[PDB]
Design a protein around this ligand. Structure first.
Ligand SMILES: C[C@]12CC[C@H](O)C[C@@H]1CC[C@@H]1[C@@H]2CC[C@]2(C)C(=O)CC[C@@H]12
Length: 267
């Protein structure tokens, strides 16, 4: 009764996943140079980014996108339902993945498949994870906020350390098939970000298609198994005590020292 799937030093949700699949993801899954993958540490804005991409493909028409659910528009390759769908989908394929770099498909590293990595202020990530995860059945829950705070800081949470996750993927930030984005810039100005994604993917849009896309992909438009139905707010400053914040800056400072500080927009 540990309440999670432990695999290669990383904890995964009990339901929906299996070791044998995780093993195949890294050893067998074949990636195509035409595939596009959304890479994120859980709760960093994957859905929003999935929306933008789906809208870009549908030229703004929020038709299909409306009916089709998240895990179907950009399924998670590491999940059962995910691995299966991707295994029988015809390129071009759009899929998501929270996997740290050392467990990602081997085939990827010799391909031209394009990857978009989205990162977010870890403070917001920790809060969203707290409220999201503590509201999901069968997965180990924290006895309290203070406790979850400690797990996140020590890496003992689903998908592992946020710090490790960023360190492992950052070394590719300059590859031509790797686009690095921040949730912060995504929110500050979707237009600018959409333009980067178009440039990175080599897509072009008619002024009127962009118009529609910009409208269906604004933060407001985004505002759209489970314990309590309710929670399905504020900011990290409404949860972190001043002491937790001072302790987190310190930890962040120590942990990210070997990486350019200006790589991270937030304070
Ligand atoms: C938990 C999560 C991956 C961690 C995410 O940021 C929160 C996501 C909720 C939907 C889950 C997904 C894992 C794979 C699942 C189980 C599927 O294949 C369909 C429902 C999917």
């Amino acid at each position: 009764s540990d309440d999670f799937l432990w695999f290669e030093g990383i904890a995964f949700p009990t339901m929906g996943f299996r070791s044998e699949t995780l093993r195949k993801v890294r050893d067998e899954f074949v990636i195509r140079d035409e595939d596009v993958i959304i890479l994120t540490y859980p709760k960093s804005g994957t859905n929003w980014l999935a929306e933008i991409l789906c809208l870009m493909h549908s030229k703004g028409d929020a038709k299909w996108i409306q009916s089709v659910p998240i895990w179907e528009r950009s399924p998670w390759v590491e999940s059962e339902i995910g691995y299966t769908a991707l295994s029988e989908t015809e390129s071009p394929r759009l899929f998501s993945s929270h996997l740290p770099i050392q467990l990602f498909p081997k085939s990827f590293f010799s391909s031209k498949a394009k990857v978009i990595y989205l990162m977010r202020n870890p403070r917001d990530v920790l809060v969203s994870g707290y409220f999201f995860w503590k509201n999901i059945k069968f997965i180990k829950k924290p006895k309290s906020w203070e406790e979850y705070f400690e797990w996140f800081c020590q890496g003992t949470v689903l998908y592992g350390s946020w710090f490790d996750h960023i360190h492992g993927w950052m070394p590719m930030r300059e590859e031509k098939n790797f686009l690095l984005l921040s949730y912060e810039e995504l929110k500050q100005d979707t237009g600018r970000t959409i333009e980067k994604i178009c440039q990175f993917l080599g897509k072009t849009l008619e002024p009127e298609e962009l118009n529609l896309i910009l409208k269906n992909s604004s933060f407001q438009s985004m505002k759209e198994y489970v314990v309590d139905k309710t929670q399905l707010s504020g900011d990290w400053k409404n949860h972190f005590t001043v002491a937790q914040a001072e302790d987190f800056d310190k930890l962040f400072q120590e942990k990210m020292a070997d990486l350019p500080r200006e790589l991270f927009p937030w304070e």
